[PDB]
Design a protein around this ligand. Structure first.
Ligand SMILES: CCCCCCCCCCCCCCCCCC(=O)OC[C@H](COP(=O)([O-])OCC(O)COP(=O)([O-])OC[C@@H](COC(=O)CCCCCCCCCCCCCCCCC)OC(=O)CCCCCCCCCCCCCCCCC)OC(=O)CCCCCCCCCCCCCCCCC
Ligand SMILES: CCCCCCCCCCCCCCCCCC(=O)OC[C@H](COP(=O)([O-])OCC(O)COP(=O)([O-])OC[C@@H](COC(=O)CCCCCCCCCCCCCCCCC)OC(=O)CCCCCCCCCCCCCCCCC)OC(=O)CCCCCCCCCCCCCCCCC
Ligand SMILES: CCCCCCCCCCCCCCCCCC(=O)OC[C@H](COP(=O)([O-])OCC(O)COP(=O)([O-])OC[C@@H](COC(=O)CCCCCCCCCCCCCCCCC)OC(=O)CCCCCCCCCCCCCCCCC)OC(=O)CCCCCCCCCCCCCCCCC
Ligand SMILES: CCCCCCCCCCCCCCCCCC(=O)OC[C@H](COP(=O)([O-])OCC(O)COP(=O)([O-])OC[C@@H](COC(=O)CCCCCCCCCCCCCCCCC)OC(=O)CCCCCCCCCCCCCCCCC)OC(=O)CCCCCCCCCCCCCCCCC
Ligand SMILES: CCCCCCCCCCCCCCCCCC(=O)OC[C@H](COP(=O)([O-])OCC[N+](C)(C)C)OC(=O)CCCCCCCCCCCCCCCCC
Ligand SMILES: CCCCCCCCCCCCCCCCCC(=O)OC[C@H](COP(=O)([O-])OCC[N+](C)(C)C)OC(=O)CCCCCCCCCCCCCCCCC
Ligand SMILES: COC1=C(OC)C(=O)C(C/C=C(\C)CC/C=C(\C)CC/C=C(\C)CC/C=C(\C)CC/C=C(\C)CC/C=C(/C)CC/C=C(\C)CCC=C(C)C)=C(C)C1=O
Ligand SMILES: Nc1ncnc2c1ncn2[C@@H]1O[C@H](COP(=O)(O)OP(=O)(O)OP(=O)(O)O)[C@@H](O)[C@H]1O
Ligand SMILES: [Mg+2]
Lengths: 106, 99, 49, 70, 231, 108, 256, 110, 67, 41, 60, 161
């Protein structure tokens, strides 16, 4: 509707309660109060839908090097893997199947 | 200009200065443009000469530079038309009948 | 009408008659880098990004 | 809280003891009067004139950075 | 969710999604040698080498304030490349830009390096702040490990390892422990831990529709006068 | 001549190769040390840097590290042509030969 | 020799050509290695931007004029133009026309000095297009593998040998010019693929082309020679020979 | 066999790191609701880094909105019914000027 | 297919025979707008939805047309 | 956590040595006042 | 390899001292008539162009 | 655990209360410190409607106060007649007349309609970003299927023998 009442009672029609409590405090909150500009422990929400890139393997090495097994994985990959990129993408099972036929002969 | 009514004894002080500012810097736009052209600035305006007499071309080059500035200065007659038309309306309204 | 005719002549038409932009270029390395860069990211596009 | 508020505290340290410890809890009217003039952290003690300067100084400075950087 | 309904949203007078060569009246036109007397142009073929030198300047002048932090230098390199790889990967046809896209980006990066040479660029001040907050947390963990104490991160890792054993010891019908199930185990522990901390209210509304601020105190009035300091 | 290394000031040393075998071993160690280099053991004298995950900007970082270790002043015109391990080896030879005859460093 | 040169260590032959979009100059010159935070001076002193524009734009611009001051010491610039400016300066208070005629020869003198003191810039893209057509050069050199080890190009002082070039023995031309407008230099090249090096020595002169008054090419290579040196092979390639090129075309003899 | 054992191990760690990125974002997003109900400076704190990039646009005087955005979607929404419908060109700085001028045999440089 | 089937069907999208004679609201609502009502934003949605139906959500036709 | 200062349950000595976010701003302004001694002088 | 990315379509002009050297001054302009005398020839011989001559005669 | 660096570089001319660089975010923070927090009313009714009679008294008190103080009020009413007629007849079309006469001039409406649509896009931010992640998570899950196959090869090779 376009006829909500008098001008004095205009701020009255805004509140909508989720409970059955009476009387109802009329004031409708506009924003959330932010008294102290505190640095949030939460991670940034910009890191939302970024595709795979260099930061993924760079951080993988940093977290893998925190383990003994991960240190062996990183060293063997960066030295003994003929790839022109660290952004490994599996689009076929050629390297997998040929590694099994060369292994199961025993 | 309403927010400057109490900033001075003249309500249109900023407008009276701005029309002069607008005139001076617009008048300087063609002057700086010819400076950017260089010594060849006349060839940018009129093009290639036609007669071998440098004195003859000088008169055609003087008119080419004259027209260069007339294209700008003559447009201020449009501003006079707006002020004259704006004043005529103010004169009719301010003298309209009320008894 | 005089307002539009003022700025459409003092600036727009005046500078259209005495200034211009060239169409010839002196360097074209962005075009050939984008082609090589696209082949570098061929596998990622194949995954539908 | 600012150094001027802390300077008032050292001067009013004995007055705060009389009001908050003795008057603010005795009884009746003396209790209400002592709890009304209690001494402590200023409720709604922000100075808007200080804050008006900080805001206008920052906004005018961002304009100075643009107008002077030519 | 919500999608733009206007089908002509990306239409410009120059074409669909054209932000490289917008249509204007003074369009570029060719010049003919035999008919041109003189010309005033600022275009040149120097943007390629200026692009190379600018990368070396920005990299080397930023590494002055890294204090030899090798991980920070390698991280900064990945960030610096993302700034220079903009024209090579953008949807915008940077090769069809109005008056030379190469010159435009080189002049744009020179304005960045000028700030970098003075150590006043916001990317630099952001890097020092982020790195200081990171090293302060790494030093906290190092002091707890030297003291034989267990870090908060190891307590969750150890707590999450025993949760998988308990779930895979009761799930004997199926034996496919997917990454989806592994995730919701950790998230159930993360929510409980985040709710345990005394954090400032991040969400606008709590369990009720009311806001979680200090201002959200309505009637009934049940608080007395504020009390003073104790001696 | 001193630089920070992990928060500690360390005196930096300069190298003088002046021999073909020392140049090849230095360049290989240089490229292998770069954190973006893939297949570090498959790297040989005839290895293209593009085949090891390196682009035009990684060649600048590699050349920047040559100026650190050898003390060269490499101009921006030379960097975009260094795209192979062989190119770094031949360039280092050309700089040392130029200084041995002309008595000065190449133009920067 | 490059006339415009600051204390900046990199890109010496491009210093006058590169037009940076800087508002003011960088705090420090381009670093040649990674430095310490205390190696440089935080918050440069007051009036630093004005000082940098003097020592990086004004001062090297004056060293360009001083380095090539021998090219502006002719009787026209030294005696005629100042003498003409002094004749009309005595009547500068009579009317405005004398002020103009007393200042014009000064502005004319500045333009000749400004044009003659600049570094000699040839059309280098013509040169590389010329050498990349030769099969004996492209056998060892390619654009994607070539690098510059040294570059030198400077005007030749005074009048040349008055048997190889009788043109410059003209009293009318000598009144306006004290030099030849010819230049000579070399190009030290190296190829990272083949390991070959060559010295590209060249001599240039202004020639008339296709028209009556305008110069055709201010820097025409009438002698272009290359001494290619490889692992064990020394070759000498003659792209343009002066004994044959000077029989077809003659210099231009700039006036004003 | 050890070649693909370590290759697939590193390949999995790359996409496990990507999985944790999307998982952790959806986790932090649970506390963020109704961007219209947050103040200006608090919304920037949730999206840390936007204030830094905003300072970069200001200090370099790139005060043309959406000039450095590849898809200036806000620029298209603002010009849905504009005369001479156009968006700013990519990385357009308000100070650059590529205007030229030539003199031909004809007038007006034609 | 059923969605496009009904969009093309003349019986589904067809004015009545007397529609030409009826009084027609010749505005979408952007001439006089309610500025201070609590449903102000919902009014703007209906204006935008009315303008989209007129141009089949190709608002370039509205930009070129007469207002 | 539970020892955080309360404006109601506060000691006199704790209020005098509070040093909150208001003082942290002032201490930053004081650093600017001191560093400007030679310029103003 | 900067020459690899140089565009030869900029060779349409030969700019030197703010003047295109490939200008047909023998067919257009004040320098077109070949019946000029000793003084007119010596005047064009100095300037080498009409644009520089006309610009100076403007102030003279 | 290796000992990390003690600290990074600390800029001597950048602080939180006096940031070196400028943006609207810092200005927005100082602005809300000035106007203070949102003055939330805890009451059941708004202040104006509860004190209409009282505010009407003080409303008319200041009208009378100005009226009793201004002895030349008739000179001000007459002095205001000309500008009141002039400015209203001059700006009528641009404010109101355009809504039913020659031109609509919908420039300001276009700015409301675009902002009203952005209000909805921000309200549905969580939905739109979650759908974009569903496609990226699908790609990530597809790449993680190769590791699940490899971890069964040891069992396959053992059971096949
Ligand atoms: C009441 C106020 C009224 C006025 C209002 C405006 C006020 C004035 C302000 C305007 C701006 C003035 C400032 C100019 C700065 C110039 C700086 C400079 O010198 O740089 C050089 C620069 C030239 O360099 P370039 O163009 O970049 O390139 C040159 C090539 O590289 C060169 O290529 P090249 O080598 O092939 O060329 C050869 C040579 C060819 O030259 C020749 O033609 C030769 C001439 C003949 C010489 C004599 C030969 C003698 C022969 C003797 C023979 C002896 C031998 C005999 C035999 C031998 C005996 C043994 O050309 C030159 O080198 C000469 C070019 C420079 C000439 C000087 C031009 C400026 C003169 C101004 C004089 C008055 C200034 C007063 C200002 C006072 C301060 C306020 O000069 C200019 O750019 C001039 C631009 C002028 C544009 C502005 C015009 C504005 C229009 C004004 C009139 C408006 C009227 C309407 C007004 C309406 C109301 C507003
Ligand atoms: C009902 C209406 C009643 C009206 C009357 C009262 C109106 C209220 C006035 C309030 C505003 C003015 C405040 C005046 C002082 C009041 C006390 C006060 O500041 O508030 C408590 C204040 C607490 O601040 P807050 O507002 O509660 O909250 C702070 C926020 O959290 C954030 O912390 P924050 O630090 O960022 O906040 C700073 C805060 C407070 O910052 C301050 O410290 C106030 C500084 C004000 C100027 C003091 C320097 C005066 C230099 C005198 C030179 C000597 C003269 C005699 C020479 C001897 C030879 C005869 O805000 C202001 O800056 C306010 C300044 C307002 C603008 C003043 C300049 C206007 C320029 C336009 C020209 C106008 C012409 C008339 C100007 C007349 C000037 C005399 O306490 C302190 O700040 C303690 C300061 C501790 C360090 C002090 C070390 C000395 C520093 C002196 C300055 C040295 C600069 C270099 C020398 C320059 C001259 C050579
Ligand atoms: C009077 C009061 C004076 C008070 C003082 C005033 C101030 C004087 C001092 C300052 C002087 C001004 C300074 C100017 C120099 C500044 C630099 C400059 O601008 O360049 C020079 C400037 C360049 O001129 P230009 O236009 O570039 O030359 C054209 C072409 O470029 C040239 O093309 P071209 O070189 O290829 O060939 C040119 C010519 C070929 O020319 C030649 O080849 C001839 C060369 C002859 C050389 C002879 C050498 C002799 C050497 C000395 C003798 C040998 C040694 C003897 C030793 C004896 C020892 C004792 O070819 C032709 O066929 C010419 C066309 C036909 C002639 C047109 C004449 C029009 C006259 C109209 C009036 C006629 C009335 C007749 C009545 C007569 C009785 C009163 O020269 C001039 O400014 C000339 C003055 C132009 C004034 C035009 C307006 C006035 C028109 C005439 C007045 C009409 C009379 C009105 C009153 C009637 C009742 C009396
Ligand atoms: C020695 C003896 C003398 C000394 C005695 C000392 C005692 C003095 C008595 C002073 C009383 C102070 C305590 C109350 C202060 C505020 C009064 C008030 O109405 O606040 C409630 C009202 C709403 O409170 P709420 O019920 O909680 O609703 C909250 C929602 O936000 C509501 O928003 P919503 O949109 O959702 O709902 C409707 C809203 C609708 O209202 C609004 O949202 C805005 C209304 C327009 C605001 C004023 C625009 C003025 C533009 C500036 C041009 C004039 C400036 C004056 C100074 C210029 C230089 C002389 O407000 C209402 O609920 C109904 C309207 C109630 C009347 C309020 C407007 C009356 C005019 C007040 C302006 C007075 C100055 C100009 C008067 C002529 C010059 C003397 O708040 C306001 O209107 C704020 C306006 C600014 C307040 C300060 C203005 C100065 C003091 C006002 C005194 C009013 C009576 C005397 C003047 C009347 C002349 C006709
Ligand atoms: C009669 C008494 C003297 C009368 C007054 C004379 C004042 C002269 C000084 C003020 C005017 C200087 C010129 C200002 C305008 C040009 C700005 C500029 O410098 O740009 C340089 C420009 C810089 O080049 P640029 O500006 O084109 O850009 C360079 C290109 N990039 C950007 C790529 C690097 O160079 C020149 O123009 C050539 C040098 C100009 C020389 C200027 C005059 C010097 C006078 C020296 C006198 C020495 C003897 C007396 C002193 C003795 C010791 C105390
Ligand atoms: C409010 C207080 C502050 C006021 C500040 C001023 C606010 C101005 C708001 C922006 C309006 C600017 C209008 C620019 C023109 C927009 C229309 C257009 O692009 O034309 C496209 C037009 C229209 O094409 P169209 O396709 O976009 O629209 C078609 C129209 N319908 C839909 C009706 C069919 O096409 C043209 O190419 C014509 C070009 C004519 C140029 C007219 C403008 C010339 C003047 C501009 C330069 C002025 C510079 C002054 C600087 C002074 C410095 C001293
Ligand atoms: C330099 O660059 C610039 C800026 O920075 C970027 C700007 O912000 C700005 C904008 C300017 C502003 C935002 C400031 C605006 C301030 C204005 C208009 C006037 C301020 C007026 C007041 C705050 C009113 C104060 C009232 C009075 C002074 C009258 C009563 C007298 C008082 C209170 C003082 C008594 C007099 C004395 C001589 C004693 C002084 C007392 C002290 C020093 C006590 C202080 C005590 C301590 C412990 C510090 C500009 C123009 C600028 O150019
Ligand atoms: N074809 C052209 N079209 C438009 N403007 C041009 C053209 N050629 C040059 N200009 C302008 O004239 C200037 C001088 O041209 P010039 O050929 O001398 O540059 P250059 O760098 O020395 O070329 P090169 O590398 O071949 O020696 C150029 O910087 C340019 O601004
Ligand atoms: Mg050149």
């Amino acid at each position: 509707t376009l006829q909500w009442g008098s001008l004095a009672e205009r701020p009255m029609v805004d509140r909508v309660m989720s409970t059955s409590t009476w009387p109802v405090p009329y004031y409708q909150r506009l924003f959330k109060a932010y008294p102290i500009r505190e640095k949030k422990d939460k991670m940034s929400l910009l890191l939302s839908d970024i595709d795979i890139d260099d930061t993924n393997w760079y951080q993988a090495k940093d977290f893998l090097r925190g383990s003994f097994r991960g240190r062996q994985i990183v060293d063997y990959v960066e030295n003994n893997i003929a790839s022109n990129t660290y952004i490994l993408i599996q689009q076929d099972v050629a390297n997998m199947a040929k590694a099994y036929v060369h292994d199961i002969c025993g | 200009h309403g927010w400057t009514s109490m900033l001075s004894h003249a309500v249109l002080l900023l407008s009276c200065y701005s029309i002069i500012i607008m005139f001076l810097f617009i008048l300087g736009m063609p002057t700086l443009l010819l400076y950017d052209f260089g010594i060849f600035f006349l060839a940018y305006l009129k093009g290639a000469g036609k007669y071998i007499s440098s004195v003859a071309e000088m008169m055609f080059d003087y008119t080419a530079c004259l027209v260069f500035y007339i294209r700008i200065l003559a447009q201020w007659i449009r501003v006079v038309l707006m002020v004259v038309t704006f004043i005529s309306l103010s004169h009719y309204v301010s003298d309209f009948d009320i008894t | 009408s005089q307002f539009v005719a003022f700025f459409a002549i003092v600036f727009w038409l005046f500078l259209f008659l005495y200034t211009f932009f060239i169409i010839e270029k002196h360097e074209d390395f962005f075009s050939k880098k984008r082609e090589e860069r696209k082949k570098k990211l061929k596998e990622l596009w194949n995954l539908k990004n | 809280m600012n150094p001027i508020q802390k300077a008032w505290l050292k001067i009013l340290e004995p007055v705060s003891y009389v009001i908050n410890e003795k008057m603010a809890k005795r009884t009746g009217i003396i209790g209400k009067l002592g709890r009304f003039f209690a001494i402590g952290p200023r409720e709604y003690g922000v100075h808007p004139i200080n804050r008006m300067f900080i805001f206008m100084n920052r906004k005018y400075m961002a304009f100075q950075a643009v107008a002077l950087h030519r | 969710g919500y999608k733009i309904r206007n089908k002509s949203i990306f239409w410009t007078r120059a074409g669909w999604k054209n932000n490289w060569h917008p249509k204007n009246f003074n369009a570029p036109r060719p010049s003919y040698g035999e008919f041109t007397m003189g010309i005033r142009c600022r275009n040149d073929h120097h943007s390629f080498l200026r692009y190379v030198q600018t990368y070396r300047n920005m990299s080397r002048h930023c590494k002055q304030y890294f204090l030899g932090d090798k991980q920070l230098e390698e991280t900064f390199i990945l960030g610096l490349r993302s700034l220079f790889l903009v024209p090579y990967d953008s949807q915008c046809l940077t090769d069809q830009i109005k008056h030379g896209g190469e010159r435009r980006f080189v002049d744009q990066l020179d304005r960045d390096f000028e700030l970098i040479s003075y150590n006043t660029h916001p990317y630099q001040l952001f890097t020092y702040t982020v790195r200081n907050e990171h090293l302060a947390w790494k030093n906290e963990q190092y002091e707890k490990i030297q003291k034989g104490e267990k870090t908060f991160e190891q307590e969750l890792l150890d707590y999450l390892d025993e949760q998988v054993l308990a779930e895979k010891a009761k799930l004997r019908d199926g034996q496919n422990f997917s990454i989806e199930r592994m995730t919701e185990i950790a998230l159930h522990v993360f929510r409980k831990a985040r709710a345990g901390k005394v954090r400032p209210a991040q969400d606008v509304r709590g369990p009720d529709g009311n806001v979680n601020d200090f201002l959200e105190q309505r009637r009934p009035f049940e608080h007395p006068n504020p009390t003073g300091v104790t001696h | 001549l001193t630089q920070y290394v992990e928060g500690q000031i360390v005196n930096r040393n300069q190298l003088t190769l002046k021999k073909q075998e020392d140049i090849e071993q230095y360049v290989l160690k240089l490229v292998r040390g770069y954190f973006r280099t893939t297949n570090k053991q498959g790297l040989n004298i005839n290895s293209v840097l593009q085949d090891h995950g390196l682009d035009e900007f990684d060649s600048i970082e590699l050349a920047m590290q040559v100026e650190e270790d050898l003390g060269y002043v490499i101009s921006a015109e030379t960097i975009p042509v260094l795209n192979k391990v062989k190119h770094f080896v031949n360039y280092i030879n050309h700089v040392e030969q130029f200084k041995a005859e002309n008595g000065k460093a190449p133009i920067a | 020799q490059m006339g415009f040169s600051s204390d900046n260590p990199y890109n010496k032959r491009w210093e006058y050509k590169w037009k940076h979009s800087y508002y003011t100059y960088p705090r420090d010159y381009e670093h040649t290695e990674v430095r310490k935070p205390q190696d440089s001076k935080d918050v440069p002193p007051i009036y630093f931007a004005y000082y940098k524009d003097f020592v990086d734009r004004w001062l090297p611009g004056m060293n360009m004029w001083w380095q090539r001051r021998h090219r502006i010491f002719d009787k026209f610039n030294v005696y005629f133009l100042p003498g003409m400016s002094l004749f009309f300066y005595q009547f500068a208070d009579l009317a405005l026309g004398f002020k103009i005629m007393a200042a014009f020869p000064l502005f004319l003198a500045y333009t000749r000095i400004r044009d003659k003191t600049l570094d000699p810039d040839f059309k280098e893209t013509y040169l590389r297009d010329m050498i990349y057509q030769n099969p004996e050069i492209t056998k060892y050199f390619n654009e994607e593998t070539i690098h510059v080890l040294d570059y030198e190009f400077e005007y030749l002082p005074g009048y040349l040998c008055p048997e190889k070039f009788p043109e410059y023995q003209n009293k009318t031309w000598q009144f306006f010019n004290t030099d030849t407008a010819q230049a000579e230099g070399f190009f030290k090249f190296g190829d990272v693929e083949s390991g070959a090096t060559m010295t590209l020595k060249f001599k240039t002169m202004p020639i008339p082309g296709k028209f009556r008054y305008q110069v055709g090419e201010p820097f025409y290579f009438y002698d272009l020679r290359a001494e290619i040196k490889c692992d064990g092979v020394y070759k000498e390639v003659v792209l343009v020979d002066e004994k044959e090129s000077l029989k077809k075309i003659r210099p231009f003899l700039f006036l004003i | 066999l050890d070649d693909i054992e370590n290759e697939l191990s590193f390949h999995a760690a790359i996409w496990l790191n990507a999985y944790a990125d999307y998982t952790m974002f959806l986790f932090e997003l649970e506390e963020y609701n109704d961007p219209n109900d947050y103040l200006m400076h608090e919304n920037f704190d949730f999206f840390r880094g936007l204030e830094t990039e905003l300072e970069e646009l200001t200090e370099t005087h790139n005060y043309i909105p959406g000039a450095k955005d590849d898809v200036n979607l806000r620029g298209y929404l603002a010009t849905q019914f504009a005369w001479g419908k156009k968006v700013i060109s990519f990385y357009r700085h308000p100070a650059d000027d590529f205007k030229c001028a030539k003199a031909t045999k004809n007038m007006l440089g034609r | 297919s059923l969605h496009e089937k009904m969009q093309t069907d003349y019986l589904w999208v067809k004015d009545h025979s007397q529609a030409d004679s009826w009084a027609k609201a010749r505005t979408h609502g952007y001439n006089y707008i309610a500025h201070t009502v609590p449903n102000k934003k919902e009014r703007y949605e209906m204006i935008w939805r009315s303008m989209g139906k007129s141009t089949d959500w190709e608002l370039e036709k509205f930009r070129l047309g007469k207002k | 956590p539970q020892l955080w200062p309360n404006p109601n349950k506060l000691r006199f000595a704790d209020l005098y040595k509070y040093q909150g976010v208001e003082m942290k701003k002032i201490n930053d302004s004081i650093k600017n006042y001191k560093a400007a001694k030679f310029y103003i002088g | 390899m900067w020459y690899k990315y140089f565009s030869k379509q900029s060779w349409n002009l030969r700019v030197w001292r703010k003047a295109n050297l490939k200008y047909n001054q023998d067919d257009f302009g004040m320098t077109q008539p070949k019946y000029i005398a000793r003084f007119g020839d010596f005047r064009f011989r100095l300037v080498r162009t009409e644009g520089a001559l006309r610009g100076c005669m403007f102030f003279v | 655990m290796k000992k990390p660096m003690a600290k990074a570089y600390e800029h001597p001319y950048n602080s939180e209360h006096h940031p070196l660089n400028f943006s609207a975010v810092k200005i927005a923070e100082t602005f809300h410190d000035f106007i203070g927090p949102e003055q939330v009313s805890p009451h059941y009714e708004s202040f104006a409607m509860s004190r209409k009679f009282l505010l009407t008294f003080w409303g008319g008190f200041f009208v009378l106060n100005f009226g009793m103080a201004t002895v030349d009020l008739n000179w001000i009413m007459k002095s205001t007649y000309i500008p009141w007629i002039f400015w209203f007849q001059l700006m009528y079309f641009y404010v109101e007349g355009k809504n039913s006469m020659f031109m609509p001039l919908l420039q300001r409406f276009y700015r409301r309609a675009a902002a009203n649509e952005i209000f909805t896009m921000e309200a549905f931010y969580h939905e739109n970003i979650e759908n974009k992640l569903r496609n990226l998570m699908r790609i990530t899950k597809g790449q993680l299927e190769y590791w699940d196959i490899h971890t069964s090869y040891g069992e396959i090779r053992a059971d096949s023998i």
